[PDB]
């Protein structure tokens, strides 16, 4: 290290150094304490390679609660072999690592490798936190909302009622009848200290995996349902239902039924009822 080049502290001027000057002049008992600054300081990858090597010498096993906050543009470099032996327990550190992981505008559609080493960090955290917190899911669905319907039936059921609130119906697009049956009650048990219009607003997202016994009970609240929220419904919850029941649900949203006649929960329920019964709907429907 030359006379006048000994790093007095972290500054702009360090960028006009080289790879070999950094290892001889920079202190390791400094780089830890003051780290937040280096995120604003544009170093070359070659200079960051040396900085990554300088902290390897100080913290060899993992990296404390302290270090991972200002990790920034190194999360990308870090490979699963060392990530395994990490610790977090802070909602803050999370967002930072996920913001920079959102530095992939290469393939806006799944490029045949959507999630590599982030996969690990997540499973690494959920074990650390214990369960899946209300707070926790909010910040996850903010980077990956579709991850909810990209779990296995198991991990879905280890999920308490007070962590359904953080769901809006944007998450439950690519969900099949199996995964919705798991989530359904958890909602009905979460939103049980409630009633009326305040009740329905939230419940609408899941109603695809619900039973006849609670289609009856909905009608007697004079509630309104759309047509898009009828194509969801399970085949076998629909067929016990009378004319007046359907008309006390879809009600105003019914007119455009004619168009969606040859589709899932309709094409059969039409035939099931009487000809006369359908003609009182005055929507031009056949079979009886």
């Amino acid at each position, epitope marked *: 290290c030359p006379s006048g080049k000994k790093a007095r502290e972290i500054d702009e001027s360090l960028i006009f150094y080289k790879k070999w000057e950094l290892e001889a002049c920079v202190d390791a008992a400094l780089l830890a304490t003051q780290m937040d600054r280096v995120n604003a300081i544009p170093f070359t990858y070659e200079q960051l390679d040396v900085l990554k090597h300088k902290l390897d010498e100080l913290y060899p096993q993992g990296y404390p609660e302290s270090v991972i906050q200002h990790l920034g543009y190194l999360f990308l470099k870090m490979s699963p072999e060392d990530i395994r032996k990490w610790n977090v327990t802070s909602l803050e550190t999370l967002k930072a690592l996920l913001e920079v992981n959102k530095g992939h505008e290469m393939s806006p559609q799944a490029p045949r490798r959507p999630l590599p080493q982030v996969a690990t960090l997540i499973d690494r955290f959920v074990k650390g936190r214990g369960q899946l917190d209300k707070d926790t899911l909010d910040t996850l669905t903010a980077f990956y909302p579709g991850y909810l319907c990209s779990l296995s039936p198991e991990e879905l059921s280890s999920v308490p009622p007070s962590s359904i609130w953080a769901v809006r119906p944007q998450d439950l697009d690519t969900c099949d009848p199996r995964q919705l049956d798991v989530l359904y009650p958890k909602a009905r048990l979460a939103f049980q200290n409630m009633n009326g219009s305040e009740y329905f607003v939230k419940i609408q997202s899941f109603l695809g995996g619900a039973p006849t016994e609670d289609l009856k009970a909905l009608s007697q609240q004079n509630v*309104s349902m759309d047509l898009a929220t009828f194509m969801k419904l399970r085949t076998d919850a629909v067929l016990p239902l009378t004319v007046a029941e359907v008309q006390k649900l879809l*009600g*105003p*949203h*019914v*007119e*455009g*039924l004619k*168009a969606e006649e040859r589709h899932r929960p309709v094409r059969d329920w039409i035939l099931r009822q009487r000809q006369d019964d359908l*003609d*009182t*709907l*005055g*929507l*031009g429907l056949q079979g009886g």
Partner: antibody
Framework: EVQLLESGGGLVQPGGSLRLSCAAS????????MTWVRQAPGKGLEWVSG????????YYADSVKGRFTISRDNSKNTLYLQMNSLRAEDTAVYYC????????????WGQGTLVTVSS | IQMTQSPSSLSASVGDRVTITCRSS??????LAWYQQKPEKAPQSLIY???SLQSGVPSRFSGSGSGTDFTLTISNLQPEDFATYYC?????????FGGGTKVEIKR
């Protein structure tokens, strides 16, 4: 394709009787319901009556409950409005409409017939 | 049962977003309609229920609200969209219509 020609609209002296027709072309008639809407000439819109698919179940607006009398048929294919004890308020253009759903919108209408009343 | 349209008459430029409003007294879920009228010629139908486009209507149109305070929009007017637009309700008998909004050009 889906037509509805109103006919029978003339002038009538006050208090006089008069009947209207709307002969449909394009739809299976038996399996939809109908209505009668009148435009206050120039400025406004207003509804008159509605009949069900059965036609035992009739609805009316209060400025004509018992004066005006709806009626329908399948074989001759004709919606009938009997407007009795007329006055100059009634003087309007009547539009015959096909209810797109059972208590839904009015989706299709007729080119429209005028009725005049005056001494 | 009241039904109020706003404004009296509106005037805007081709390619500007047109904002028409429809209020009521008593709540009417989504039993509300939207109809276009050409001078001394048949009325045409648009939105049949709150946010539901009638068969053969350009998607530039947009029907919104719920309960009492509603809205009809037109993103980028076109030249054949100048008309007397009408807001109607059908929840209860009788059916009710609005004061109609006469939407004109600007020179």
């Amino acid at each position: 394709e889906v037509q509805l020609l109103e006919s029978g609209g003339g002038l009538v002296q006050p208090g006089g009787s008069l009947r209207l027709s709307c002969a449909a072309s394009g739809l299976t008639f038996r399996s939809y319901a109908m209505t009668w809407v009148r435009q206050a000439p120039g400025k406004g819109l207003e509804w008159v009556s509605g009949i069900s698919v059965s036609g035992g179940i009739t609805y009316y607006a209060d400025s004509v409950k018992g004066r005006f009398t709806i009626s329908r048929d399948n074989s001759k294919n004709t919606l009938y409005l009997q407007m009795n004890s007329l006055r100059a308020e009634d003087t309007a253009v009547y539009y015959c409409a096909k209810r797109g759903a059972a208590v839904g919108s009015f989706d299709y209408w007729g080119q429209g017939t005028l009725v005049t009343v005056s001494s | 049962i009241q039904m109020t349209q706003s404004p009296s008459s509106l005037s805007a430029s081709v390619g500007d977003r047109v904002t028409i409003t429809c209020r009521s007294s008593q709540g009417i879920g989504s039993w509300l309609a939207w109809y276009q009228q050409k001078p001394e010629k048949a009325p045409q139908s648009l939105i049949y229920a709150a946010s539901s486009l009638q068969s053969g209507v350009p998607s530039r149109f947009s029907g919104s609200g719920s309960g009492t305070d509603f809205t009809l929009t037109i993103s980028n007017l076109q030249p054949e969209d100048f008309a007397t637009y009408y807001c109607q309700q059908y929840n209860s008998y009788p059916l009710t219509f609005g004061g109609g909004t006469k939407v004109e050009i600007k020179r």
